[PDB]
């Protein structure tokens, strides 16, 4: 008796679980090669207008391709919440949460273990990961020099996974003044990626100051001096006012001919209420008509036009002041201050300067390259950068990279799974050497050996020696200290437990019902 | 240049009969004092930019405008105004209560020649206190097709100009430097 | 000759290859590459 | 066959009475009721002809609802309009509808500012123009570089009305069909 | 006819606008009710304004939606209507005594029978069936018997 | 036929009839359809199952409403299965899976009794009579726990907690969830004890963190930022002062207008400089009155334009915009307040009074939301949920209400039993002791509904793998050894098939509603003797 | 009789007056209690929001300074109409017509229930068992057109919201809550009970 | 009876006039049987079907005599002069109880 409609298909045997299995082996075998600092960046063609997209992150990789199975969503979504959440360490969670249902696969079909065995021995293995990450933290909170200096490492980690692998070395100090200039802002919309075609990939800068996209717009001056700020949001031009109802009973044209002029005289009695400031430089984010343009000339104020929302909170906190409206107050109200202002062209489009502010609360990067597609993974390296930098501010604990992470998880795993006598030692073991993999296909993607370099770091660790790891330039142990490579403590906590939880999710499932498509 | 029909709504009433020959003469003399005013400045020359939402010079002005020989040219784009102001010097005009002479630029001789069925407006001479002069340079050719290309060659011709006074310096082409980096790599490469 | 009905002549290596739709994306970089010689330099747009 | 339907279908109650000379009474008066009828019904329809600006609260209350109008399946179409001051558009937009209020007085011609009609929308994409007909949104227009753009004009515009079902092909009111008395008077004359 | 619109210039207008459509509305039912009427039968669809002071009083509203439907009933009372709103004239009232509300098949009906004194014309017929056949062919057999009653008229 | 065509319903060729005993087949084999995927599923050792919606959304869910609410079916016998669970789902909230189980199990018995020619309203009528009887005797062997202090009665409620999040997801943290929801149901209760309010608490759920970061806060979720982001984001409250002085307005910032339509006519140009300042001083008196009231927070419904976002910064007052009516009702219960409609009837009374205000960012760019919290006991609990994935954080929202819903069921006097398993077989050897006495002719009847009761524990066997027989033979042998009725299943594996040792506890309303919903359904299914269905 | 999906048959009860869902989430609908010991039930058809009066709208103004007055008048004459209902003392407060959000939040403040979206075969069932009548105009009010019951209690049913009428001393209604597991239970026990309440 | 209509709506019931209702009956004869139970459903609300099964039952045993020689209107006046006596003799059936 077939109870479903036309057109359904159901799995409810061992294939649902192999269908399921192997859709996560797919999603894992995809981001192997893009792990690590030797790993290979990949290609995507779209299917509409043709428009090709460069990215080594495994989130924009797993959204953009399509993908039908249930199991490959839970790849697809877990990687999206790490994107949003942290913006690093996604593939890490898709390749770790699919090796575990990889090795969660061996025990279903040879060993025959149940479901919840399995995840009730990565609850207390999990459990016993992160009190592993309590211990092996160190806070360098103390010394803001000290910090000063993880930072920098953290950006010589982050930033070697992309394509700006030898230009690290100076990004990293780009990127570090960029949080020191934030002060512990961790909001990432508060800093402008101008994208600029053309040049040497190492002629990046960060200026101290904002960049404007546009320019002035008729005949105010590019270069002046001493200039004070006045943002506005406000209409400001040919205001029509809050109730749309309003209108003129006319009884003759020349009674008109004033009303129109008084729609000019408030006008100009508005900018009138400007110059009560004693101001050299005006900003407003609605497109300025001509009529308020011209009234600026004679009292000689600079006028900048068309300005975007989201730009008028950078531009008022690199300038320190207030935006400001109803100008009949000016004592209450705030302006900011600036040393010079100069017009500059970085390529066809012109941009202005700004330098010499007082309040340093955002800054903008401008990037160059050869290919927008260059450029564009230089868009997304820089923003995963900043982004575990800006958590590092309020996490300022870190955890220490290059295999040693995953392996002291894997000694404090494997010390718990002799105190636990039964048939959940094997799922506990499952999870630890589940984590063996993370250093494996990192060394794979360099080009060497799998099993003795990895038996070589398992020696070093149970000696007592908790800061050895894995060094790809030469293919040999090394001390982590003096390499300078670190992560931060959310980040090895967010994918220890973005892994687990995803391996929680397809393996309490049985049965898969697929519906028609709509 | 327009009759008035501000911004904001409006509806205009009429009440009695008489009043349709006021506003009749109100209108015209609406745009007879503003070309009254004109004429007190002694502005020869007027260019309107794309009017939007009414018609830029109304039909009933361009016979006061005609009839005191102001030549008028319309349906300019935006942002070509930057370059007008910034070639002839002349500030631009935004109500006739900012309208004065000083603000106006000058120019010897505005001529429209009648030549192969193709306009010309041309400006002979300019003379301002300007730091920023500027300059245009017409295209000629048979089709479209060798005027767009003609256009990128000079393109192409002026970018070499624009990177010898950005970059000083400059070295001998013909091949030359790929004979002699190649050479001169390949002297070290030997030694590497 | 384009989709629409404009004809257009073209040395410049940045038109010649703007105008040409490329299939592949690898060789549709090359067209980046002639937009960014041709915004940084203006000149050689063909020899890179 | 069209030759006997032209008398008719082609002359309104202004034009029928042309024919009252050639063609019979009973044929032509019993028509004339009939479009006489049509013309009644036009006016209790006529609950409109100026634009609507209203308020965010009112947005309901004015447009979804009175998209219903008697609910005889008496659906009104409202038409709806994102403004914004900023945009070239939008101002274009706006005359539109003070001129279309003015002729086309059963449709309901609705205004309101973008910023206060979405939740933080998107300010490139206005300005925004909505069709509701009986709760349902029968179109939603995205901005007017279909329509001509900077260049739309008012035979545009009414040609989009058509489009949507709010204006019949062959109504006299519309501009395509509108012809002016000059062209009448030359067809006659050359005929 | 044309064009119905408010308009109030001034907030004194606009608070009189709500009670004046109030008071006249009730105004118009007292030269009604004062004259000893219980029930109206209204031509077209009736203002709920004008039902909340028709049931004050305990008078009867019927809906006739119809040109037929309005002139068949005068004929039982023998009531000459008037369009106007004011007060109907003595003589033209008509005299109904009983109007009862019964279930006879599941719906609601009402009900106008007189009496033997001041006997009144075009009386109906309840016919009650099973099949909804039956009674249109019945019904017709009343047409023709009442067809065959104008027979005796004219010779 | 005699050669005319032979037609009596529209549709004739389309649609088919059934009849007889393969009606029947078709019945109870479509009942083991459902069933065998909502055996495997019950129980603490089940497994989820992804539902795929017609749009490409999944959801992966373990309770039978959802699983049956998202599937397409054809056969109508499983809809009236699929209201079944949604009727356990609405009302009770517990026992969907079993619902379906058990009425299959009904089912699964009554073929064998079909098959011996027992007239079905017979067979109808025999479980009607034993589903009194059972609910009869249960009611008497259960223990009233009102008599217990309140100490004890929160002990209650995290033996009921635990069995609730347990056999869901979110049975790792159920140990703080089981805390968390009765910490819930602390804050938002009668004095009495008594008719709770279930509509105080909604649920809200966010995607992101992990499941250790969700707690415990008393306030409104708006997602929402603050107008004009200058002002610092975390506001506190004064000095002295009661509090931070809540205000909500449902009329947005601008001149007051008529509601109707209107034509301000201005025709001349001092009226028309008169028409400035009345739009300067209506932004002057506007400020002025919520400055006069005392208020720092102001919530707005109709949002307004930025003319008021300056003059809001300076006086140091944050706002919002763009509020639906919705959570103005949540806002109102939760702080206390009054929301006054306009500024004229502005008064200090109807502020509301809250702890403080704040906002952070959960990650990189998401969006910003709103948080707000208590200083007291207040009768508004909003849960504050995280989850790694969508569909993680979307099962611990129906999972979270479930677990509210169990509470709501012992908040009802005298409302408990011990589960496990132990309430079926204990309800099951009564019945077969009745039948050896009312035999009649039902005697079967009664043997159908005492063995379809067990197959709950044959469940719990199957899916912890244990020997079904050796089970309900331990079970069914203690049972008559000794008189002592709280004995089950325990498939967690902490011996002892004890259990009040284990501290589970499941609703006494919500146990008989097992066998009435079971029973109700069965007598309808029975009943069906002629199937027309039409084609699609 | 109504229909509420979920629930069993075994559970239903006999009530002494009518049951009928809200159909609406208001803004103010949790600030009003939910108890009250001595309620009186008014019958209103008026629509309590602000909106057009007399279908229509058009005002014209001249001066900008009554501008401001002529909406103060619309505030003044709809809390007018409101407070000719508050009163009288009616606690519960019924319409056919919708009823705005300006309206029940100035009844949630001082302790008045109120509901809407109600058809009219329900509002004629509310007269009868409360014993009152209809009024469509607030000015004509009295005390003695009110209706009363012994108690009100609105309570969870079905994940549906009811208000009970229940002890009235005359009674002309008799309405009972149909709850069952599928659509047809709850439609089978309905003409059951219909072609059984037909014979008696 | 179980019935599903073209547009997917699930019923369950045992009634001559709602099993009749959502069964679309293009035959005219039969629409008769339909006829009869809302007439019987719209007054009484009971015995709907023991009205149909007896209908059939009536032309089911006029069909042998209609095969024979014996006219329609033989047929009808049987069961009209008949049902006078049915009726008075159910008079008769039926009590006058007033006490209890
Ligand atoms: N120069 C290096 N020496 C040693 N280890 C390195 C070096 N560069 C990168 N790594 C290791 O490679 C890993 C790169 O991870 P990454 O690609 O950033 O993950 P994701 O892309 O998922 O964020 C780091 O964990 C780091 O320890
Ligand atoms: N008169 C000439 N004689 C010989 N070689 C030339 C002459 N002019 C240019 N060349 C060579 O030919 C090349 C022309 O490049 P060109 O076509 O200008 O590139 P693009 O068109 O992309 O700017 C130059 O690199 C130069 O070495
Ligand atoms: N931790 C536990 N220990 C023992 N029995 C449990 C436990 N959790 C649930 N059960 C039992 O499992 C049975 C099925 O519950 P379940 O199907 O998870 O709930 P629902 O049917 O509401 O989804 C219940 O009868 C209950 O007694
Ligand atoms: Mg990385
Ligand atoms: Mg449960
Ligand atoms: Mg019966």
Redesign the interface.
Known sequence: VQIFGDQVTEERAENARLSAFVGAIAVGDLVKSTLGPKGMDK?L?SASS?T?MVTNDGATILKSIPLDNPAAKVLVNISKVQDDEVGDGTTSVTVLSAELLREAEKLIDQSKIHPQTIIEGYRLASAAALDALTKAAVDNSHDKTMFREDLIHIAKTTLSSKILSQDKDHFAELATNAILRLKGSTNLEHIQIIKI???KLSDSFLDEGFILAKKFGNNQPKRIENAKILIANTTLDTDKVKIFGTKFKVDSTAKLAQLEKAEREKMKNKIAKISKFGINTFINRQLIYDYPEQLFTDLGINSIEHADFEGVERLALVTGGEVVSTFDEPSKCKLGECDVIEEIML??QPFLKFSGCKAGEACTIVLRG????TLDEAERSLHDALSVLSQTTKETRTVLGGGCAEMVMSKAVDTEAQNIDGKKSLAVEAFARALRQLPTILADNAGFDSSELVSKLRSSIYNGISTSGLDLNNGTIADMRQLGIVESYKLKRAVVSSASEAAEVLLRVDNIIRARPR | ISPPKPDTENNIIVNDYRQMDKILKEERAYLLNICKKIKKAKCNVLLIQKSILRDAVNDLALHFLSKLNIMVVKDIEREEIEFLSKGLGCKPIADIELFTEDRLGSADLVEEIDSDGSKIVRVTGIRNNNARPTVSVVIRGANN??I??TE??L??A???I??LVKERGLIAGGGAPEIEISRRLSKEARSM | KTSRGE??????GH?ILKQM?I?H??A??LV??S???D?????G?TSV | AKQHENRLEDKDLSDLEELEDDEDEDFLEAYKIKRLNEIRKLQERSKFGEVFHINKPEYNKEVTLASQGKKDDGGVYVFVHLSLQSKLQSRILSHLFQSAACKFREIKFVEIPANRAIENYPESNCPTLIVYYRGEVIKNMITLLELGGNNSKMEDFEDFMVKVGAVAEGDNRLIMNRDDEESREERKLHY | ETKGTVLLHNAQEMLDFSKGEEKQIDAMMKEIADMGVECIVAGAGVGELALHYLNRYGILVLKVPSKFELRRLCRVCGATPLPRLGAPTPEELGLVETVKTMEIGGDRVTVFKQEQGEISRTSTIILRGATQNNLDDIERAIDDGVAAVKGLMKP | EMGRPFIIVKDQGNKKRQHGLEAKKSHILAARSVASIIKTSLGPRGLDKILISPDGEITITNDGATILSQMELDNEIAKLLVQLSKSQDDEIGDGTTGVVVLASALLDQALELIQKGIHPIKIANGFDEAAKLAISKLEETCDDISASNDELFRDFLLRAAKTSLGSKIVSKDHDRFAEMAVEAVINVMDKDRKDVDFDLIKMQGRVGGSISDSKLINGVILDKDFSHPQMPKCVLPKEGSDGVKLAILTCPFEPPKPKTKHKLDISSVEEYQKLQTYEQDKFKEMIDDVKKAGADVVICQWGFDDEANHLLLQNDLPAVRWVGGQELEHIAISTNGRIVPRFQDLSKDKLGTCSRIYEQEFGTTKDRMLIIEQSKETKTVTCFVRGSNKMIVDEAERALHDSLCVVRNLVKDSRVVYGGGAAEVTMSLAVSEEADKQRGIDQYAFRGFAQALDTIPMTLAENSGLDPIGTLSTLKSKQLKEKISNIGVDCLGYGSNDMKELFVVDPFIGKKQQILLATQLCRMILKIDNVIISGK | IKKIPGGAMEESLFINGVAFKKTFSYAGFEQQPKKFNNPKILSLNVELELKAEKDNAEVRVEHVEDYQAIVDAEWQLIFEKLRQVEETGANIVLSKLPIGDLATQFFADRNIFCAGRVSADDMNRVIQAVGGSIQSTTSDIKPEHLGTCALFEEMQIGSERYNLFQGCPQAKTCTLLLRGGAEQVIAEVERSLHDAIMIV | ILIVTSNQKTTISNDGATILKLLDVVHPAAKTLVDISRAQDAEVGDGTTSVTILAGELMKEAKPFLEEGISSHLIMKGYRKAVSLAVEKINELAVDITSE
Request: glycine residues 8%; charged residues 25%; negative net charge.
């Open positions: 290609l063609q043709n090709c075609l053309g040049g390529g066809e050869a290919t927008d597609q | 097709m060798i767009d290309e990128r060659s393109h192409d002026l970018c070499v624009r990177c | 004809i257009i002549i073209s040395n410049d038109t739709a299939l994306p690898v549709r970089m980046e590459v937009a960014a010689q915004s940084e330099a203006g000149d747009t």
